[PDB]
Design an enzyme around this catalytic site. Sequence first.
Site, PDB file in Angstrom:
ATOM      1  N   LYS A  66       0.850  -1.187   0.000  1.00  0.00           N
ATOM      2  CA  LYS A  66       0.000   0.000   0.000  1.00  0.00           C
ATOM      3  C   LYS A  66       0.890   1.243   0.000  1.00  0.00           C
ATOM      4  CE  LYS A  66       0.579   1.705   3.304  1.00  0.00           C
ATOM      5  NZ  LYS A  66       1.858   2.425   3.623  1.00  0.00           N
ATOM      6  N   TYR A 103      -4.276   3.985   6.466  1.00  0.00           N
ATOM      7  CA  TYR A 103      -4.698   3.015   7.490  1.00  0.00           C
ATOM      8  C   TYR A 103      -6.017   3.427   8.133  1.00  0.00           C
ATOM      9  CZ  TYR A 103      -0.177   0.624   7.330  1.00  0.00           C
ATOM     10  OH  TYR A 103       0.924  -0.095   6.928  1.00  0.00           O
TER      11      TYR A 103
HETATM   12  N1  NAP Z   1       2.461  -2.407   4.924  1.00  0.00           N
HETATM   13  C1  NAP Z   1       3.355  -1.675   5.807  1.00  0.00           C
HETATM   14  O1  NAP Z   1       3.246  -1.798   7.021  1.00  0.00           O
HETATM   15  C2  NAP Z   1       4.441  -0.787   5.217  1.00  0.00           C
HETATM   16  C3  NAP Z   1       5.446  -0.307   6.008  1.00  0.00           C
HETATM   17  C4  NAP Z   1       6.437   0.482   5.472  1.00  0.00           C
HETATM   18  C5  NAP Z   1       6.412   0.789   4.118  1.00  0.00           C
HETATM   19  N2  NAP Z   1       5.406   0.322   3.326  1.00  0.00           N
HETATM   20  C6  NAP Z   1       5.370   0.635   1.956  1.00  0.00           C
HETATM   21  O2  NAP Z   1       6.601  -0.127   1.243  1.00  0.00           O
HETATM   22  C7  NAP Z   1       7.061   0.627   0.294  1.00  0.00           C
HETATM   23  C8  NAP Z   1       8.571   0.938   0.594  1.00  0.00           C
HETATM   24  O3  NAP Z   1       8.646   1.606   1.836  1.00  0.00           O
HETATM   25  P1  NAP Z   1      10.008   1.568   2.715  1.00  0.00           P
HETATM   26  O4  NAP Z   1       9.732   2.052   4.136  1.00  0.00           O
HETATM   27  O5  NAP Z   1      10.551   0.162   2.696  1.00  0.00           O
HETATM   28  O6  NAP Z   1      10.982   2.612   1.987  1.00  0.00           O
HETATM   29  P2  NAP Z   1      12.566   2.473   1.837  1.00  0.00           P
HETATM   30  O7  NAP Z   1      13.091   2.016   3.182  1.00  0.00           O
HETATM   31  O8  NAP Z   1      13.129   3.805   1.401  1.00  0.00           O
HETATM   32  O9  NAP Z   1      12.896   1.401   0.704  1.00  0.00           O
HETATM   33  C9  NAP Z   1      12.423   1.677  -0.606  1.00  0.00           C
HETATM   34  C10 NAP Z   1      13.255   0.778  -1.577  1.00  0.00           C
HETATM   35  O10 NAP Z   1      12.712   0.764  -2.767  1.00  0.00           O
HETATM   36  C11 NAP Z   1      13.932   0.751  -3.822  1.00  0.00           C
HETATM   37  N3  NAP Z   1      13.829   1.777  -4.815  1.00  0.00           N
HETATM   38  C12 NAP Z   1      13.689   1.622  -6.150  1.00  0.00           C
HETATM   39  N4  NAP Z   1      13.665   2.843  -6.722  1.00  0.00           N
HETATM   40  C13 NAP Z   1      13.793   3.764  -5.729  1.00  0.00           C
HETATM   41  C14 NAP Z   1      13.825   5.144  -5.764  1.00  0.00           C
HETATM   42  N5  NAP Z   1      13.751   6.170  -6.755  1.00  0.00           N
HETATM   43  N6  NAP Z   1      13.965   5.853  -4.625  1.00  0.00           N
HETATM   44  C15 NAP Z   1      14.080   5.205  -3.436  1.00  0.00           C
HETATM   45  N7  NAP Z   1      14.044   3.836  -3.402  1.00  0.00           N
HETATM   46  C16 NAP Z   1      13.899   3.120  -4.553  1.00  0.00           C
HETATM   47  C17 NAP Z   1      15.035   0.846  -3.145  1.00  0.00           C
HETATM   48  O11 NAP Z   1      15.571  -0.528  -2.942  1.00  0.00           O
HETATM   49  P3  NAP Z   1      16.826  -1.021  -3.808  1.00  0.00           P
HETATM   50  O12 NAP Z   1      18.088  -0.373  -3.266  1.00  0.00           O
HETATM   51  O13 NAP Z   1      16.872  -2.524  -3.682  1.00  0.00           O
HETATM   52  O14 NAP Z   1      16.622  -0.618  -5.258  1.00  0.00           O
HETATM   53  C18 NAP Z   1      14.639   1.389  -1.754  1.00  0.00           C
HETATM   54  O15 NAP Z   1      15.495   0.927  -0.798  1.00  0.00           O
HETATM   55  C19 NAP Z   1       6.199   1.904   0.309  1.00  0.00           C
HETATM   56  O16 NAP Z   1       5.251   1.847  -0.671  1.00  0.00           O
HETATM   57  C20 NAP Z   1       5.529   1.899   1.698  1.00  0.00           C
HETATM   58  O17 NAP Z   1       4.208   2.616   1.636  1.00  0.00           O
HETATM   59  C21 NAP Z   1       4.419  -0.474   3.861  1.00  0.00           C
END
Ligand code: NAP
Lengths: 335, 335
Positions: free
Chosen positions: B100, B185
């Site tokens: 999401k 949420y």
């Molecule tokens: N369901 C939940 O409880 C929950 C919790 C947190 C987040 N989320 C969702 O999961 C998704 C990611 O969130 P996150 O907290 O994991 O963020 P994050 O820590 O910044 O990780 C995002 C990852 O996506 C990759 N990526 C590819 N293109 C990117 C770009 N232009 N800029 C930044 N990253 C890019 C990168 O991995 P690579 O280095 O491998 O390319 C980056 O590390 C979001 O949509 C968020 O809404 C859901």
Amino acid sequence: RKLGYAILGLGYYATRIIMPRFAECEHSRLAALVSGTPEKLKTYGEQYGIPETHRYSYETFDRIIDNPDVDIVYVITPNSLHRPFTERAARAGKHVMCEKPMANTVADCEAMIAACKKAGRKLMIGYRSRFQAHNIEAIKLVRDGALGPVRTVVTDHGFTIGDPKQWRLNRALAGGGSLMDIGIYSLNAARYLTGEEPVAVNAVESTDRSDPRFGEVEDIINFQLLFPSGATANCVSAYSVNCNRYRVSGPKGWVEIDPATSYQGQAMRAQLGGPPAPREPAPQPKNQFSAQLDHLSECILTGREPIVGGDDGLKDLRVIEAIYRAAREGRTVKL
Amino acid sequence: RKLGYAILGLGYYATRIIMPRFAECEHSRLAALVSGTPEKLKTYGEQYGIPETHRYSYETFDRIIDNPDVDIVYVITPNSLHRPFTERAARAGKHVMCEKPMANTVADCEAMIAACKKAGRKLMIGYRSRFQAHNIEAIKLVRDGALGPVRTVVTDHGFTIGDPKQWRLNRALAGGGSLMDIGIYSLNAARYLTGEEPVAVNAVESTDRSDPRFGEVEDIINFQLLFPSGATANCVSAYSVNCNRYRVSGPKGWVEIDPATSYQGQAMRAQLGGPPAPREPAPQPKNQFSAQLDHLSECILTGREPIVGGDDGLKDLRVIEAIYRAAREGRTVKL
Ligand SMILES: NC(=O)c1ccc[n+]([C@@H]2O[C@H](COP(=O)([O-])OP(=O)(O)OC[C@H]3O[C@@H](n4cnc5c(N)ncnc54)[C@H](OP(=O)(O)O)[C@@H]3O)[C@@H](O)[C@H]2O)c1
Ligand SMILES: NC(=O)c1ccc[n+]([C@@H]2O[C@H](COP(=O)([O-])OP(=O)(O)OC[C@H]3O[C@@H](n4cnc5c(N)ncnc54)[C@H](OP(=O)(O)O)[C@@H]3O)[C@@H](O)[C@H]2O)c1
């Protein structure tokens, strides 16, 4: 020095809640009774040792000008009668304590304020939560900056109402539904927690008009407030759920009370830059009712203005009119 | 017996939260990694024993079509990248788990659903709360009529966001502010607690554009929902206060959870047959994360549709568009 109260409208709040609390007052005493029910004057007059000379019907009430034992009339009637009894109390040269909601409309509140001003008498609205320990603690934490700037106030007030024949469900006597009776606590709290007045209002009504209770007044009307600082409030007002609470939050933390504005039983929880935990408020000397009563008396004795004067009741009615308008027109109403 | 997952986007949620939870899955295994960071492919590939043949860059990702060990791609990227990776995954013949918010717009969601449908593959959105014990209990209580008809849902979700440079505060990558990330949420809960879809929406935005965090996206956007049954919701979405909770109420009582949709620590309180009391929920076989993962696998194995498929993500984006419009136009938006 104690000032004398005449209680007007011997109903549930007057007889079960307010009148017993004169015992804990320091500057207030029960001096007279005013009632449309002869039997009540006898019962409560005899119970509280109020002489027949200090007992009035609504038809002898204007003679109270001649009673020097009466300094204040406390009007505790259905809402639509707040204004006319307040005007007559002022006409009899008495200060006035008036229950919430102040009156049915903004214009009615303005009339009451003008009447008391012309009589050179003080006017106070019964917002007792401003004298309740947990509420004071919450207000002061906000003002002391414990939360940082207020960002959100989320407050719900309602109770599941019953008997369809009661005056609260009669528009002519109540002036409106849950918002007039119980939702006003959510409004009044949003205002005293922020210390601001709202500049924008949203609302949505939800009422089943086929319900025997709700042919004339609203059941649910929930509303949003925006304040000049950017502070926001989400508020519930209901006649079909039981709720009584608020949480106020800023970037540095939050504090909540649940129940918040009840007669007793307040419980506070806070999260102030550490883990969430119960919080006891600073002790208050007297209960909120006795405190409310004495506040007016003390204001008269010292020449101060009540912290919840007629203007506070008016400010609530201003937003209430806006809330009703927003729900009716389906738009944000500016103030 | 175990379908293979490819994890795409090795950021905080994928690496710290999701990947360790394959441990408790019964029908799901970690089979592949997809990343724009070669070092991450090394680190986590070695840590989880993922062969080099099962590691992909974004540039080589489409080759995954020839990897029979991959059944599912789990897209865990910034929001604006959900759609292209989901479409590529579908064209590579994979089922898709998408985090999401599903995507930035209704139209984007529709395209994703179309892509997976055309590929004859399943699509599920990562609403883990639907597999979390306390949430399941709250839903069951509502569905069993324990509260009577739902009258109000009051739900607040927010956290004090930090680094101004992160992608969540960049419109091009996040699609919007707190509503897209955390307020969803509040919205999703209102929908699954009522079991309904909203027909009217109010909203108010409050954002200090001088704050380094909020030059592009919103801080606070609070909203009201009205549903066909007459149910209402007051919702908070925020990037400058910490909240995570909901209370759903009807005339027979209420139940709340605070924190409600966190990774851990859920605590439920209810007012049903008596005064408010803590309530332990019926136990679940596994944690919300492993359960979410296994749910898609089991749906595929048994040919059933996910309880939170693409249409659920779409239904959220429909209300999100309306919420943004309501706040911008200062009016009730009908749906
Ligand atoms: N369901 C939940 O409880 C929950 C919790 C947190 C987040 N989320 C969702 O999961 C998704 C990611 O969130 P996150 O907290 O994991 O963020 P994050 O820590 O910044 O990780 C995002 C990852 O996506 C990759 N990526 C590819 N293109 C990117 C770009 N232009 N800029 C930044 N990253 C890019 C990168 O991995 P690579 O280095 O491998 O390319 C980056 O590390 C979001 O949509 C968020 O809404 C859901
Ligand atoms: N601050 C608070 O916490 C609080 C709590 C409860 C109520 N209130 C407010 O107090 C006021 C009265 O509420 P209540 O709960 O005490 O109501 P109540 O029990 O129904 O009593 C109302 C009294 O007003 C008198 N009255 C005069 N004209 C009346 C008329 N046409 N119809 C009905 N009663 C009439 C009656 O007393 P007589 O027989 O002596 O004439 C009646 O007993 C309301 O404005 C309410 O909003 C405030």
